[PDB]
RNA sequence: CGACUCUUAGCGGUGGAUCACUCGGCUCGUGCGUCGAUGAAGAACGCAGCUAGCUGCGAGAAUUAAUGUGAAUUGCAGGUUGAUCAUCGACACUUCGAACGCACUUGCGGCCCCGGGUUCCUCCCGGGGCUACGCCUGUCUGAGCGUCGCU
RNA sequence: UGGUAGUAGCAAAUAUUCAAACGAGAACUUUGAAGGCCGAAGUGGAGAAGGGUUCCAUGUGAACAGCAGUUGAACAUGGG
RNA sequence: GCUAAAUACCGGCACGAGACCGAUAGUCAACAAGUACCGUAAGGGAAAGUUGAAAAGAACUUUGAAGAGAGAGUUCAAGA
RNA sequence: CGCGACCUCAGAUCAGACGUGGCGACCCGCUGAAUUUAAGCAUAUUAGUCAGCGGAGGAAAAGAAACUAACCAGGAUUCCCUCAGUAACGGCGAGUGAACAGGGAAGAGCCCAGCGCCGAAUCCCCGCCCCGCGGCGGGGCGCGGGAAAUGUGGCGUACGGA
């Protein structure tokens, strides 16, 4: 009965999708997340797996308030100026 | 007809706010016709009654915010959102007259023995 | 040979830059030979296209000295589309058929505002370059 | 489960309107290579996780 | 195994050298910059020798 | 909010509320029915609001 | 003759090998070399007339204002005193997230000020602004059979 | 991509028959009749966990439901 | 206790180039790719480019319910 | 008993500020193996390397001798060639392995504590007025508040200084 027959008492599921990370491993009971580790104020990062680095970095996302930042490093970050109206 | 930004800055806040809400209500009723299934005119125009209002709540948004930076111009302590938001670091960074500051030393320093522009002859 | 180090002269960029350009260079990208008559009266010599200049067509099956006027511009193909170069479908309706504005001549511009000062800052950077030359 | 949570059922609802077909205007585009929506989903198939 | 004749040779490459190489295809680069901001500096002093 | 709603249908066309009962529906959106008072018809409110 | 099997050729079925194309990679080099509590990276959810993915965007939601340019976008409808694109310095930018009233079900609060009730008389509802830890300077309130001076 | 090979097999839990309807087409859908089974610790009626639109109606029969299907927990439209 | 310069750079922005690779190659990824998909989780992780100059994407007739054929027509070419 | 100071420690949704986290190629500090080699293997080797933790910058670190030398002496730090696969370390086995001088790139020097001398001659904050303010500063008026004598500022630091 260590097979098939045991694989059918899958129905209580042990992660849950996290708060921060968006992936499905925020364990339960150790109300800890396995991804990125939510409690812990530092995000979960080792160098021993480039490939899981890279799959969630500065680049990947939206970055939505850094890619404006890098078009006004190029105007040296202008602040109340306008164009003169015509 | 084509409502644009020119003619709505010298406009009040109240008749741009008595403008706004009959922006809003029309847009309503075009939803509403959207719903039931009309003619692709009110389709069309959704678009252009959103965009109007959008227009309509960035000018009184200027306007706002031009007002209080105007009033607080001269004040020493001012909102964090009038503040200039520059980069973190920049911020952080001393400004032009303390970095200028030059102690009495190196002040005389450059008073006794200053850099002097001198030539060799070959 | 060009000597500008911050001008590209590799094939896929050069390609990537013409196949992705926005729609305010595909109009100048898009530009048509004026005639010899356009070019002697007012010294220039291409224009970008438009969409009511009459124009004739030089190369292609639909060449000839027949004049049209230009109905629309469609940019996203590099096509323009004329007032009777067309064909019919197999329904019998009739489409018009995709002519690339290098193989078209300007006959008579529509001139406007702010054509006539485009046509006299080209004609007066001509101007002083020949004069320039010598 | 009939107890579904706030989060779990908007996170359903997602994926349902994300599971209905490509409209038949799309696929009349120029630069279009969509032939059909390959990333559709199946309640017996994909069990979408969770 | 060594061959019938020849030296006896202990090379250092038993570390992991190939993390760690230089390479100076960036020599002559190098040498323009260098030269550039010397020149750079020589009309910056314009009456003083370049030298220092 | 129901009391939210209930305000706001009332603002918006001048018509008293009963009862408010919303929930949301597997697509996202909340749909809410909104019983009105007894003095006023469903029929001529939906006729003047432009759903028929 | 016939049927079947084997060899070759023609043609017809797979299957995408070779060849030619390449808006893609790899490497070298150059200049610059900037994130964040005024809320970063990331995640979630939404936003198109017809819209799933991608892309873009944030209740002003395939974008607002301004500048440059100057007659389009386009798969189908609809409507020069500036359409579309590019630039982008003004405005805005939902919910989690160092995430900050407590925990994370999005529940339970507290304080102050407004609008509905009242006509401040207390509830109740809606709206606006604060309530995270550590820590520097100053201010206030303090405590000590700590050191004191006077009665 | 071949020989195997149109082969192995499509044999756990007694069982189907008749007439009509739609339909182009019926051993398989629907109706009616008959004969049966589960036999109230059920092949019944309702929950928790789990799944997440599989629930309902119409249309299609391209692909799947190891035969076929006028049927579907299939596909497309709208609700709930 | 402070201090530029010459020095390092496989992260980032914008660039130029190559005796390199040419879709089983080259980054895992030339395409809706760290996407689909599997695992409870840490993580693992693909296949997949070529109509035509222009869709001009085959009007119309004929058998069949249709898939799909026979004519006809577009194209230099449907032996695209 | 009380009043008023000083000192140590609290509470503040007190006024004004700062740190939190992320990328992390390059850099700084710490921790830190086993594969492998030694034809086995324990010292060694892999190796101050991988892994792990902390902290930044546009570069970082270092840095102006408690130096190198023993010559007729040089003179901050850093990087290239060279010294050199050398001195040297090593079950003296496998193997490991610098530095000085020299030629170049660059080249820039300095500041406190202390000893002293000047009525704390110093500095911070809040109120008001003027000027420009999208790097909140300059001038003036406050018998305004505070820090500081348990030491601020000027002269002045090993090359002498007063
Ligand atoms: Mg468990
Ligand atoms: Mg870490
Ligand atoms: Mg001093
Ligand atoms: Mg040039
Ligand atoms: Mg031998
Ligand atoms: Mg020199
Ligand atoms: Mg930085
Ligand atoms: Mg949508
Ligand atoms: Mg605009
Ligand atoms: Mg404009
Ligand atoms: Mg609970
Ligand atoms: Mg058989
Ligand atoms: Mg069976
Ligand atoms: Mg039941
Ligand atoms: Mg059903
Ligand atoms: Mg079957
Ligand atoms: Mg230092
Ligand atoms: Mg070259
Ligand atoms: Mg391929
Ligand atoms: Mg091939
Ligand atoms: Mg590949
Ligand atoms: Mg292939
Ligand atoms: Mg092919
Ligand atoms: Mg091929
Ligand atoms: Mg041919
Ligand atoms: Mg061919
Ligand atoms: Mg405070
Ligand atoms: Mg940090
Ligand atoms: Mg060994
Ligand atoms: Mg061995
Ligand atoms: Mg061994
Ligand atoms: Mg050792
Ligand atoms: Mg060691
Ligand atoms: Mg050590
Ligand atoms: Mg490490
Ligand atoms: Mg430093
Ligand atoms: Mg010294
Ligand atoms: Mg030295
Ligand atoms: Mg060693
Ligand atoms: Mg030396
Ligand atoms: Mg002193
Ligand atoms: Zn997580």
Redesign the interface.
Same mark, same amino acid.
């Given at each position: 009965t260590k097979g098939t027959s045991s694989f059918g008492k899958r129905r209580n599921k042990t992660h849950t999708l996290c708060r921060r990370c968006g992936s499905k491993a925020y364990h339960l009971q150790k109300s800890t997340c396995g991804k990125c580790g939510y409690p812990a104020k530092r995000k979960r990062k080792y160098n021993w797996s480039a490939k899981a680095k890279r799959r969630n970095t500065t680049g990947t996302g939206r970055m939505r308030h850094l890619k404006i930042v890098y078009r006004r490093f190029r105007h040296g970050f202008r602040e109340g100026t306008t164009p003169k109206p015509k | 007809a084509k409502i644009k930004a020119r003619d709505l800055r010298g406009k009040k806040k109240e008749e741009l706010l008595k403008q706004l809400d009959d922006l809003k209500v029309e847009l309503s009723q075009l939803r509403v016709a959207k719903v039931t299934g009309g003619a692709a005119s009110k389709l069309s125009k959704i678009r252009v009654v959103r965009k109007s209002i959008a227009r309509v709540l960035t000018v009184i948004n200027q306007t706002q915010k031009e007002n209080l930076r105007k009033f607080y111009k001269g004040k020493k302590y001012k909102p964090l959102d009038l503040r200039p938001k520059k980069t973190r670091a920049m911020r952080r960074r001393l400004n032009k007259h303390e970095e200028s500051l030059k102690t009495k030393k190196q002040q005389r320093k450059e008073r006794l023995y200053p850099l002097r522009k001198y030539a060799v002859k070959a | 040979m060009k000597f500008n180090p911050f001008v590209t002269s590799d094939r896929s960029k050069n390609r990537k830059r013409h196949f992705n350009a926005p729609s305010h260079i595909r109009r100048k990208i898009m530009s048509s030979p004026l005639s010899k008559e356009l070019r002697q009266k007012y010294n220039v010599r291409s224009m970008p296209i438009r969409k009511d200049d009459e124009v004739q067509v030089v190369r292609g099956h639909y060449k000839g000295q027949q004049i049209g006027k230009v109905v629309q511009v469609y940019r996203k193909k590099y096509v323009i589309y004329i007032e009777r170069v067309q064909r019919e479908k197999a329904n019998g309706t009739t489409v018009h058929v995709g002519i690339h504005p290098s193989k078209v001549v300007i006959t008579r511009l529509k001139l406007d505002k702010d054509r006539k000062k485009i046509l006299e800052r080209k004609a007066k950077s001509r101007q002083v370059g020949k004069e320039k030359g010598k | 489960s009939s107890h579904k949570t706030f989060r779990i059922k908007r996170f359903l609802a997602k994926k349902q309107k994300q599971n209905r077909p490509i409209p038949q205007w799309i696929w009349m585009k120029t630069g279009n290579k969509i032939r059909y929506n390959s990333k559709r989903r199946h309640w017996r198939r994909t069990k979408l996780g969770l | 195994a060594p061959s019938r004749n020849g030296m006896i040779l202990k090379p250092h490459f038993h570390k992991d050298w190939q993390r760690r190489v230089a390479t100076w295809f960036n020599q002559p680069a190098r040498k323009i910059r260098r030269r550039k901001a010397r020149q750079a500096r020589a009309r910056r002093i314009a009456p003083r020798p370049a030298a220092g | 909010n129901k009391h939210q709603i209930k305000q706001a249908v009332k603002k918006?066309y001048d018509i008293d509320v009963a009862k408010v009962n919303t929930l %949301?529906r597997?697509? /996202?959106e909340k749909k809410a029915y909104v019983r009105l008072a007894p003095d006023y018809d469903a029929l001529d409110v939906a006729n003047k609001? /432009? %759903? %028929?």
């Open positions: - | - | - | - | - | 918006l %949301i597997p697509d /996202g609001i /432009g %759903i %028929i």
